[PDB]
């Protein structure tokens, strides 16, 4: 399991937790030296448990699917909460089996659904380590509208930072003050499947992408990634979604 404590957290301990999260995810191959996540894992082994403590030391346990880093559900005291989607319902067979009650959240866990329930697009939600502290405190007290907002923060500060070194650095800069995500951060989040697929397809095509991936850069707009020598591939993306799941 991996754990992160917000009391005394600074950019370095957060960097250590994100390194541990990447290292807990299984892979057999590296494509262009990036870990390629497995196509499927059987049973309970498919789920990684993250223990997160807020500044006051209260905790939630989050279950992550190791083949795609998607958050399935979480445990707060004796209640488990799972997204309303089939994969999270399969995950409930393996994790948090000692929960006294199981609540299914009224939404699935993708960004479109969560932003509708929360009432705000995530360009307008501040993220950082203070925001993660607040997100953990909110999840301890069931409220489905408030939980959608907290889960948008939680997903971006754990799963998205594990997938892209740029987003981990964005959160390290927001260690003591939250700030809404840059447009670059939103584009990267949205492009992980696409980028993962084109890096895999570039093997056997001399490192050239079959279809270019367009991102928006940090200080402006539209840019096209066409091959694996790009900095997004060499220095940024840390994990690849297996094409068998795209």
Residues 102/80, Cβ–Cβ less than 8 Å: yes
Locate 87 and state its tokens: 């994969």
User: Are residue 138 and residue 168 in the same domain, yes or no?
Assistant: no
Experimental structure resolution, Å: 2.0
| CATH number (domain holding residue 226) | 4.10.470.10
Alpha-carbon distance of 27 to 127, in angstroms, equals 29
Locate 143 and state its tokens: 């409220």
Locate 14 and state its tokens: 């957060």
Task: Select from 151, 215, 229, 222 the least CA-distant residue to 185.
Answer: 215
Strand partners, 2: 50
CA 192 to chain CA centroid, nearest Å? 11
User: Are residue 23 and residue 125 in the same domain, yes or no?
Assistant: yes
Task: Tell me how long the chain is.
Answer: 246
Task: Select from 19, 26, 29 the least CA-distant residue to 162.
Answer: 19
> Counting Cβ atoms within 10 Å, is residue 219 exposed (0-12), middle (13-18) or buried (19+)?
exposed
Alpha-carbon distance of 31 to 76, in angstroms, equals 37
| CATH number (domain holding residue 114) | 3.40.420.10
Of 130, 162, 194, the domain-final residue: 162
Strand partners, 48: 64
User: Are residue 135 and residue 152 in the same domain, yes or no?
Assistant: yes
Residue 154 has, within 13 A of its CA and on its CB side, a CA count of 32
Determine the structural domain holding residue 124 and report its residue range.
1-162
User: Are residue 26 and residue 141 in the same domain, yes or no?
Assistant: yes
Alpha-carbon distance of 151 to 107, in angstroms, equals 11
Of 92, 127, 162, the domain-final residue: 162
User: Are residue 104 and residue 214 in the same domain, yes or no?
Assistant: no
User: Are residue 183 and residue 71 in the same domain, yes or no?
Assistant: no
Place of tokens 């007290």: 141
Within the chain, strands assigned E span 2-5, 27-31, 34-37, 47-53, 59-65, 70-76, 79-82, 101-104, 208-216, 222-227
Residues 209/198, Cβ–Cβ less than 8 Å: yes
Alpha-carbon distance of 81 to 238, in angstroms, equals 29
- Contacts of 113 by beta carbon, 8 Å cutoff, 6+ apart: 107
User: Are residue 173 and residue 147 in the same domain, yes or no?
Assistant: no
Of 162, 195, 213, the domain-final residue: 162
Locate 107 and state its tokens: 């939404």
CB atoms within 10 A of CB 220: 9
User: Are residue 225 and residue 236 in the same domain, yes or no?
Assistant: yes
| Number of domains into which the chain is organized | 2
User: Are residue 120 and residue 194 in the same domain, yes or no?
Assistant: no
Alpha-carbon distance of 63 to 99, in angstroms, equals 13
User: Are residue 197 and residue 132 in the same domain, yes or no?
Assistant: no
Alpha-carbon distance of 183 to 121, in angstroms, equals 12
Locate 232 and state its tokens: 């997004």
Place of tokens 């937790």: 17
Is 173 assigned a catalytic role? no
User: Are residue 142 and residue 174 in the same domain, yes or no?
Assistant: no
Alpha-carbon distance of 53 to 221, in angstroms, equals 37
User: Are residue 238 and residue 218 in the same domain, yes or no?
Assistant: yes
Locate 52 and state its tokens: 């997160």
Q: Which of 85, 123, 160, 168 is catalytic?
A: 160
Phi–psi pair at 8, nearest 5 degrees = 80, 10
Alpha-carbon distance of 12 to 19, in angstroms, equals 10
């Amino acid at each position: 399991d991996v754990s992160f404590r917000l009391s005394g957290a600074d950019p370095r301990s957060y960097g250590m937790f994100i390194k541990d999260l990447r290292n807990a995810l299984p892979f057999r191959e590296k494509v262009y030296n990036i870990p390629l996540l497995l196509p499927s894992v059987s049973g309970a082994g498919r789920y990684l448990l993250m223990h997160l403590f807020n500044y006051d030391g209260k905790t939630i346990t989050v279950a992550v699917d190791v083949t795609n880093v998607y958050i399935m559900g979480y445990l707060a005291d004796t209640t488990s909460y799972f997204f309303n989607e089939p994969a999270a319902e399969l995950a409930s067979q393996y994790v948090f089996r000692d929960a006294r009650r199981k609540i299914t959240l009224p939404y699935s866990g993708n960004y479109e659904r969560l932003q509708i329930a929360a009432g705000k697009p995530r360009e307008k939600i501040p993220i950082g380590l203070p925001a993660l502290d607040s997100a953990i405190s909110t999840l301890l007290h069931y409220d489905s509208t408030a939980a959608a907002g907290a889960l948008l923060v939680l997903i971006q500060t754990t799963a998205e930072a594990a997938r892209f070194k740029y987003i981990e650095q964005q959160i390290q800069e927001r260690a003591y003050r939250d700030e809404v995500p840059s447009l670059a951060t939103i584009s990267l989040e949205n492009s992980w499947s696409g980028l993962s697929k084109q890096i895999q397809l570039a093997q056997g095509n001399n490192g050239i992408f079959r279809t270019p991936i367009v991102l928006v850069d940090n200080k402006g707009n539209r840019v096209q990634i066409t091959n694996v020598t790009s900095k997004v591939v060499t220095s940024n993306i840390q994990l690849l979604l297996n094409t068998r799941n795209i």
